[PDB]
Amino acid sequence: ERDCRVSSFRVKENFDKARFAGTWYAMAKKDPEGLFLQDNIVAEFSVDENGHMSATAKGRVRLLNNWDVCADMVGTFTDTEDPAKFKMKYWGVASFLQKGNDDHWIIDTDYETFAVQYSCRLLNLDGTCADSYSFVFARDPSGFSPEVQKIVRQRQEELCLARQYRLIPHNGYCD
Numbered sequence: 001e002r003d004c005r006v007s008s009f010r011v012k013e014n015f016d017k018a019r020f021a022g023t024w025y026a027m028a029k030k031d032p033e034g035l036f037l038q039d040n041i042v043a044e045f046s047v048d049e050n051g052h053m054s055a056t057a058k059g060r061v062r063l064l065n066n067w068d069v070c071a072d073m074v075g076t077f078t079d080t081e082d083p084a085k086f087k088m089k090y091w092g093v094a095s096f097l098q099k100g101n102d103d104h105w106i107i108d109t110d111y112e113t114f115a116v117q118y119s120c121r122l123l124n125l126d127g128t129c130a131d132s133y134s135f136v137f138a139r140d141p142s143g144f145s146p147e148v149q150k151i152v153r154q155r156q157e158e159l160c161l162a163r164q165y166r167l168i169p170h171n172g173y174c175d
Ligand SMILES: CC1=C(/C=C/C(C)=C/C=C/C(C)=C/CO)C(C)(C)CCC1
Pocket: 035, 036, 037, 043, 044, 055, 056, 057, 061, 071, 073, 074, 075, 090, 091, 096, 097, 098
Protein backbone atom coordinates (compact mmCIF):
# COMPACT_ATOMS: atom_id res chain seq x y z
CA GLU A 1 0.00 0.00 0.00
CA ARG A 2 2.78 2.56 0.49
CA ASP A 3 3.31 4.16 -2.93
CA CYS A 4 7.02 4.10 -3.71
CA ARG A 5 6.72 5.47 -7.24
CA VAL A 6 9.13 8.40 -7.57
CA SER A 7 6.50 10.46 -9.42
CA SER A 8 4.27 10.16 -6.30
CA PHE A 9 6.78 11.69 -3.89
CA ARG A 10 5.93 14.97 -2.30
CA VAL A 11 8.48 17.72 -2.28
CA LYS A 12 8.79 21.07 -0.48
CA GLU A 13 5.90 23.49 -1.06
CA ASN A 14 6.95 26.89 -2.42
CA PHE A 15 10.63 26.06 -2.10
CA ASP A 16 12.67 29.23 -1.57
CA LYS A 17 16.15 28.96 -3.08
CA ALA A 18 17.43 32.14 -1.42
CA ARG A 19 16.35 31.06 2.06
CA PHE A 20 18.01 27.68 1.47
CA ALA A 21 21.39 29.22 0.79
CA GLY A 22 24.37 28.89 3.12
CA THR A 23 25.95 26.05 5.03
CA TRP A 24 24.35 22.66 5.38
CA TYR A 25 26.06 19.83 7.31
CA ALA A 26 25.22 16.25 6.13
CA MET A 27 24.22 14.33 9.21
CA ALA A 28 22.94 11.12 7.66
CA LYS A 29 22.85 9.59 4.17
CA LYS A 30 21.41 6.80 2.10
CA ASP A 31 23.90 5.65 -0.53
CA PRO A 32 23.48 4.95 -4.20
CA GLU A 33 25.44 2.40 -6.17
CA GLY A 34 29.11 3.00 -6.74
CA LEU A 35 31.45 5.69 -5.60
CA PHE A 36 29.95 8.24 -3.24
CA LEU A 37 30.86 10.79 -0.61
CA GLN A 38 31.60 9.02 2.68
CA ASP A 39 31.73 11.53 5.50
CA ASN A 40 32.84 15.01 6.62
CA ILE A 41 30.21 16.21 4.15
CA VAL A 42 29.43 19.91 4.22
CA ALA A 43 27.59 21.77 1.45
CA GLU A 44 27.54 25.51 0.71
CA PHE A 45 24.56 26.66 -1.34
CA SER A 46 24.36 30.01 -3.11
CA VAL A 47 21.82 31.81 -5.32
CA ASP A 48 22.76 34.63 -7.66
CA GLU A 49 20.84 37.73 -8.64
CA ASN A 50 18.98 35.97 -11.43
CA GLY A 51 17.89 33.08 -9.17
CA HIS A 52 20.51 30.60 -10.31
CA MET A 53 21.32 28.16 -7.53
CA SER A 54 24.73 26.49 -7.18
CA ALA A 55 26.68 24.76 -4.46
CA THR A 56 30.08 23.65 -3.38
CA ALA A 57 30.57 20.58 -1.22
CA LYS A 58 33.41 18.99 0.64
CA GLY A 59 33.59 15.41 1.82
CA ARG A 60 35.93 12.44 2.16
CA VAL A 61 35.77 9.77 -0.50
CA ARG A 62 37.76 6.61 -0.70
CA LEU A 63 38.68 5.62 -4.16
CA LEU A 64 38.18 2.04 -5.45
CA ASN A 65 41.86 1.56 -4.44
CA ASN A 66 41.73 2.55 -0.70
CA TRP A 67 43.01 6.08 -1.47
CA ASP A 68 41.21 8.58 0.78
CA VAL A 69 40.79 12.07 -0.67
CA CYS A 70 38.91 15.18 0.22
CA ALA A 71 36.58 15.78 -2.69
CA ASP A 72 35.88 19.41 -3.47
CA MET A 73 32.73 19.33 -5.56
CA VAL A 74 30.74 21.91 -7.49
CA GLY A 75 27.08 21.72 -8.57
CA THR A 76 24.97 23.99 -10.70
CA PHE A 77 21.16 23.61 -10.59
CA THR A 78 18.61 24.00 -13.35
CA ASP A 79 15.10 24.90 -12.34
CA THR A 80 12.09 22.85 -13.49
CA GLU A 81 8.31 23.12 -13.45
CA ASP A 82 8.44 22.17 -9.77
CA PRO A 83 10.25 24.75 -7.62
CA ALA A 84 11.66 22.01 -5.39
CA LYS A 85 12.95 19.76 -8.20
CA PHE A 86 16.24 20.58 -9.94
CA LYS A 87 18.68 19.01 -12.29
CA MET A 88 22.20 19.24 -10.74
CA LYS A 89 25.24 19.17 -13.00
CA TYR A 90 28.27 18.41 -10.84
CA TRP A 91 32.03 17.95 -11.04
CA GLY A 92 35.12 18.08 -8.89
CA VAL A 93 37.94 20.57 -8.52
CA ALA A 94 40.19 17.53 -9.14
CA SER A 95 39.68 16.18 -12.66
CA PHE A 96 39.53 12.52 -11.47
CA LEU A 97 36.44 13.05 -9.29
CA GLN A 98 33.05 11.90 -10.60
CA LYS A 99 31.06 14.19 -12.85
CA GLY A 100 27.42 13.85 -13.66
CA ASN A 101 23.89 15.18 -13.87
CA ASP A 102 21.53 14.12 -11.09
CA ASP A 103 18.04 15.02 -10.04
CA HIS A 104 18.14 17.08 -6.89
CA TRP A 105 14.87 17.22 -5.00
CA ILE A 106 14.22 19.13 -1.73
CA ILE A 107 11.78 16.80 -0.03
CA ASP A 108 11.36 18.94 3.04
CA THR A 109 13.08 21.69 4.92
CA ASP A 110 12.36 24.36 7.49
CA TYR A 111 15.36 26.34 6.14
CA GLU A 112 16.71 27.10 9.61
CA THR A 113 17.21 23.61 11.08
CA PHE A 114 16.96 20.64 8.67
CA ALA A 115 16.62 19.53 5.09
CA VAL A 116 15.88 16.21 3.44
CA GLN A 117 17.24 15.87 -0.08
CA TYR A 118 16.66 13.06 -2.59
CA SER A 119 17.91 11.89 -5.97
CA CYS A 120 16.73 8.97 -8.04
CA ARG A 121 19.32 8.03 -10.63
CA LEU A 122 17.42 5.18 -12.26
CA LEU A 123 13.74 4.20 -12.43
CA ASN A 124 12.55 0.69 -12.27
CA LEU A 125 10.00 -0.28 -14.88
CA ASP A 126 7.29 0.06 -12.19
CA GLY A 127 8.26 3.67 -11.46
CA THR A 128 9.96 2.96 -8.14
CA CYS A 129 13.59 3.99 -7.81
CA ALA A 130 16.25 1.43 -8.66
CA ASP A 131 19.22 3.58 -7.52
CA SER A 132 18.73 6.47 -5.11
CA TYR A 133 20.64 8.63 -2.69
CA SER A 134 19.43 10.96 0.04
CA PHE A 135 21.00 13.38 2.49
CA VAL A 136 19.66 14.63 5.78
CA PHE A 137 21.21 18.08 6.31
CA ALA A 138 21.40 20.25 9.42
CA ARG A 139 22.20 23.90 9.91
CA ASP A 140 23.80 22.98 13.22
CA PRO A 141 26.09 19.93 13.31
CA SER A 142 25.48 19.26 16.98
CA GLY A 143 22.20 17.54 16.33
CA PHE A 144 18.44 17.68 15.93
CA SER A 145 15.75 18.00 18.48
CA PRO A 146 13.54 14.98 19.01
CA GLU A 147 10.75 16.99 17.37
CA VAL A 148 12.75 17.50 14.14
CA GLN A 149 13.91 13.87 14.20
CA LYS A 150 10.29 12.76 14.15
CA ILE A 151 9.61 14.75 11.00
CA VAL A 152 12.78 13.57 9.27
CA ARG A 153 11.87 9.95 10.00
CA GLN A 154 8.48 10.50 8.46
CA ARG A 155 9.97 11.96 5.29
CA GLN A 156 12.35 8.98 5.09
CA GLU A 157 9.36 6.64 5.24
CA GLU A 158 7.62 8.63 2.50
CA LEU A 159 10.64 8.15 0.23
CA CYS A 160 10.61 4.41 0.93
CA LEU A 161 14.05 4.80 2.46
CA ALA A 162 13.29 4.24 6.13
CA ARG A 163 16.02 2.34 7.96
CA GLN A 164 18.38 2.79 5.00
CA TYR A 165 20.34 5.76 6.30
CA ARG A 166 23.65 5.86 8.16
CA LEU A 167 24.94 8.56 10.45
CA ILE A 168 27.89 10.48 9.05
CA PRO A 169 30.80 11.77 11.17
CA HIS A 170 32.53 15.08 11.12
CA ASN A 171 36.08 14.86 12.38
CA GLY A 172 37.99 17.56 10.54
CA TYR A 173 39.38 15.28 7.83
CA CYS A 174 38.81 17.78 5.06
CA ASP A 175 40.72 20.78 6.50
C1 LIG B 1 27.70 18.49 -5.95
C2 LIG B 1 26.77 18.46 -4.78
C3 LIG B 1 26.23 17.29 -4.16
C4 LIG B 1 26.60 15.94 -4.59
C5 LIG B 1 27.85 15.45 -4.70
C6 LIG B 1 28.23 14.19 -5.21
C7 LIG B 1 27.19 13.21 -5.84
C8 LIG B 1 29.55 13.85 -5.11
C9 LIG B 1 30.21 12.73 -5.51
C10 LIG B 1 31.54 12.57 -5.53
C11 LIG B 1 32.27 11.45 -5.94
C12 LIG B 1 31.59 10.07 -6.21
C13 LIG B 1 33.68 11.50 -5.86
C14 LIG B 1 34.65 10.38 -6.22
O1 LIG B 1 34.99 10.52 -7.60
C15 LIG B 1 25.20 17.38 -3.03
C16 LIG B 1 23.99 16.47 -3.29
C17 LIG B 1 25.90 16.93 -1.76
C18 LIG B 1 24.66 18.81 -2.92
C19 LIG B 1 25.75 19.88 -2.90
C20 LIG B 1 26.46 19.84 -4.25
